[PDB]
Design an enzyme around this catalytic site. Structure first.
Site, PDB file in Angstrom:
ATOM      1  CD  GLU A  35      -3.114  -0.666  -0.088  1.00  0.00           C
ATOM      2  OE1 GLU A  35      -3.057   0.453  -0.627  1.00  0.00           O
ATOM      3  OE2 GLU A  35      -3.949  -1.529  -0.454  1.00  0.00           O
ATOM      4  CG  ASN A  46      -8.711   6.821  -4.275  1.00  0.00           C
ATOM      5  OD1 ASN A  46      -7.875   5.943  -4.465  1.00  0.00           O
ATOM      6  ND2 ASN A  46      -9.169   7.124  -3.061  1.00  0.00           N
ATOM      7  CG  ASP A  48     -13.630   8.362  -5.857  1.00  0.00           C
ATOM      8  OD1 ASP A  48     -12.430   8.559  -5.585  1.00  0.00           O
ATOM      9  OD2 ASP A  48     -14.419   7.821  -5.053  1.00  0.00           O
ATOM     10  CB  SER A  50     -11.693   9.882  -2.193  1.00  0.00           C
ATOM     11  OG  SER A  50     -11.583   8.741  -3.017  1.00  0.00           O
ATOM     12  CG  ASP A  52      -6.617   5.177  -1.065  1.00  0.00           C
ATOM     13  OD1 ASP A  52      -7.787   5.554  -0.814  1.00  0.00           O
ATOM     14  OD2 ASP A  52      -6.383   4.114  -1.663  1.00  0.00           O
ATOM     15  CG  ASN A  59     -10.993   5.976  -0.408  1.00  0.00           C
ATOM     16  OD1 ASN A  59     -11.119   7.202  -0.520  1.00  0.00           O
ATOM     17  ND2 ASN A  59     -11.227   5.147  -1.409  1.00  0.00           N
ATOM     18  CG  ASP A 101     -17.319  -1.373   6.663  1.00  0.00           C
ATOM     19  OD1 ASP A 101     -18.282  -1.251   7.431  1.00  0.00           O
ATOM     20  OD2 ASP A 101     -17.237  -0.701   5.610  1.00  0.00           O
TER      21      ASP A 101
END
Length: 129
Positions: A35, A46, A48, A50, A52, A59, A101
């Site tokens: 990561e 990202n 969209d 957003s 990380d 995120n 989650d």
């Protein structure tokens, strides 16, 4: 901060990631390697809009507030800047929510792509834990 492999393993273990939700410590060290390359300041945008953040690439679409994702959630109840701290506590506490989650460690695409199903115990080779 850029952690060493065993240095990060020790910090993760201290903060309770070892076997958390059944994922051995090597999973978490492997996830961090791919990561963030063990870099607490890693950030990647990202597509969209957003971003990380940090050692586990959390995120901002759902998990922290950076003010730049208008209307997004802040499910860890923290500013995203906190997830870039040299101490990993905030990232760990948030990662524990993420892994619970509904999809386990599949939440981390790099873990899925490069750690899942491999000999993840190799990532704690030679560590004094």
């Amino acid at each position: 901060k850029v952690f060493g492999r065993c240095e990060l393993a020790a910090a993760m273990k201290r903060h309770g990631l070892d076997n958390y939700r059944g994922y051995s410590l090597g999973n978490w060290v492997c996830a961090a390697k791919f990561e963030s390359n063990f870099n607490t300041q890693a950030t990647n945008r990202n597509t969209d809009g957003s971003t990380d953040y940090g050692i586990l690439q959390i995120n901002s679409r759902w998990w922290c507030n950076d003010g730049r994702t208008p209307g997004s959630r802040n499910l860890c109840n923290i500013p995203c800047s906190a997830l870039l701290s040299s101490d990993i506590t905030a990232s760990v506490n948030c990662a524990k929510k993420i892994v619970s989650d509904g999809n386990g460690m599949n939440a981390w695409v790099a873990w899925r792509n490069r750690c899942k199903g491999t000999d993840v115990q190799a990532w704690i080779r030679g560590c004094r834990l």
